[PDB]
Structures are given as C-alpha cells and as structure tokens.
C-alpha cells in the first residue's frame, strides 16, 4: 500500500472526513472501523476525536487498500494519516470505534487494529467501559 497526499477540507463526524484528493473535493470514509452516530453514545467524543487529529495535523494522507476505492455513496474508502499517524487505529486503540465491516480484499490492516482493539477493551476504554 502507498501512501498519497490529501487535504482537509472539513470534518464531519468519528469515522467520516470531507478531504481534497487529487485536487477534488472527497467524502472519505474509514476502513475496517466503525464509529458511534452523533446521536449516540460516545458519537460526540469519537467525532471530537477525529476532528481535532485530523484539524491538528500539518500532513494528511489517505491510503488506499487493494480493493474497491469508493463505496456506494460515492466515499473515498481509505486508511486516513495525521502526520504519520493513522486515524482509523487511534479511534479503535482509544475505544472510541470497534473493528468492523471487514471485507475481504480491503482488509491490510485487519491485524493492526485487532490489536488495538484487544488493548482497548483490556484497558475497558469508552465503548468498552
Ligand atoms: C466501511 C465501509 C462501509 N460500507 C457501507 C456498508 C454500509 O451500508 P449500509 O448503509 O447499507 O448499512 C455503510 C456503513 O457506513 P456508515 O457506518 O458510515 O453508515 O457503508 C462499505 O460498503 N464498505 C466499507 O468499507
Ligand atoms: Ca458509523
């Protein structure tokens, strides 16, 4: 996997960033997590979340996986980077989203983020509390 260059555009909620991808305007949406709605528990703190690392980082990158790059809605799918960081990890190591919507072919970065997973629930983090 590569990883290339985006921009922030505006944060939207745990899970989901609207991002400038080769120069146009993307929804992107996190691989391999799944973030709480707004309107649920925890849907504040893990939008906050995202917001603030995204917002924070002097460098975003987006990296795709081997299999389809957009889902049905038109979203980017991807491994989101705040300087060097990945998003879709830190929500799942901070118990703020739980690994899921594993689909095969777009998978890479499964092991990674049961482990963080596995930390965070043993810490009983957020969702996990
Ligand atoms: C994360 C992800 C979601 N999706 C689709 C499945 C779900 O369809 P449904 O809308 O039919 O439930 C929806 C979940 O996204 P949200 O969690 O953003 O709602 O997005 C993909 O197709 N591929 C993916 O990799
Ligand atoms: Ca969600």
Redesign the pocket.
Known sequence: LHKEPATLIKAI?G??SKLMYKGQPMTF???????P?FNEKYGPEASAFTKKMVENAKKIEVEFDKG?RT???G?G?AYIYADGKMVNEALVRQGLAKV????KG?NTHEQLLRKAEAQAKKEKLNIWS
């Open positions: 909620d899970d989901t949406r996190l691989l391999l997590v799944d973030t709605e389809q889902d049905k809605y979203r799918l899921a919507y594993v689909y777009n």
